[PDB]
């Protein structure tokens, strides 16, 4: 266990099963959070737009880490 | 994309990468639904205890649907 989704490389992300790619995408994009400002853990329209972009941006850059794709994304949550 | 994390068979789950198995094991313990007046969406100690047990339930019962292992687990609310 714990081969590390946060250390999965982008070439490996685009090669994992497309069933389990969907949970991986939000786990990363919302960075395993406890959720702040409320409990509205639903997919937001930014999130729904980013689910394809976190895949495209990996096949476009196969050398990158999977979890650094959080740095671009705002989601909805407060600082 | 758009393969069924919600219908990954248990023989297919124990064959997915141990990197992305971790997101799927939470995702199944806490569905794409919305929360019920709390913050226990974290990898709390019940979830940390269930994440290995649901992997063990798939390799011992490889015919089951991975998401059946939610129906046993009353963890997706505050207590």
From Swiss-Prot, chains A, B:
Its main location: periplasm. The keyword Electron transport does not apply. Keywords: Acetylation, Chaperone, Periplasm, Signal. Disruption phenotype: Mutants display increased sensitivity to acid stress at pH 2 and pH 3. It is found in: Periplasm. The modification N6-acetyllysine is found at residue 64. One of its GO terms (cellular component) is outer membrane-bounded periplasmic space. Induction: Induced by the EvgS/EvgA two-component regulatory system. Negatively regulated by H-NS and the TorS/TorR two-component regulatory system. One of its GO terms (biological process) is response to acidic pH. One of its GO terms (molecular function) is unfolded protein binding. Required for optimal acid stress protection, which is important for survival of enteric bacteria in the acidic environment of the host stomach. Exhibits a chaperone-like activity at acidic pH by preventing the aggregation of many different periplasmic proteins. Belongs to the HdeB family. Homodimer at neutral pH. Dissociates into monomers at acidic pH. In vitro, HdeA is more efficient than HdeB at pH 2 and HdeB is more efficient than HdeA at pH 3. In vivo, both are required for optimal protection against acid stress at either pH 3 or pH 2. This is Acid stress chaperone HdeB. It comes from Escherichia coli (strain K12).
């Amino acid at each position: 266990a714990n081969e590390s989704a946060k250390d999965m490389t982008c070439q490996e992300f685009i090669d994992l099963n497309p069933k389990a790619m969907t949970p991986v995408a939000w786990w990363m994009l919302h960075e395993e959070t406890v959720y702040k400002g409320g409990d509205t853990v639903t997919l937001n329209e930014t999130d729904l737009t980013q689910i394809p972009k976190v895949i495209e941006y990996c096949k476009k850059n196969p050398q990158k880490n999977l979890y650094t794709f959080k740095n671009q994304a705002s989601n909805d949550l407060p600082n």
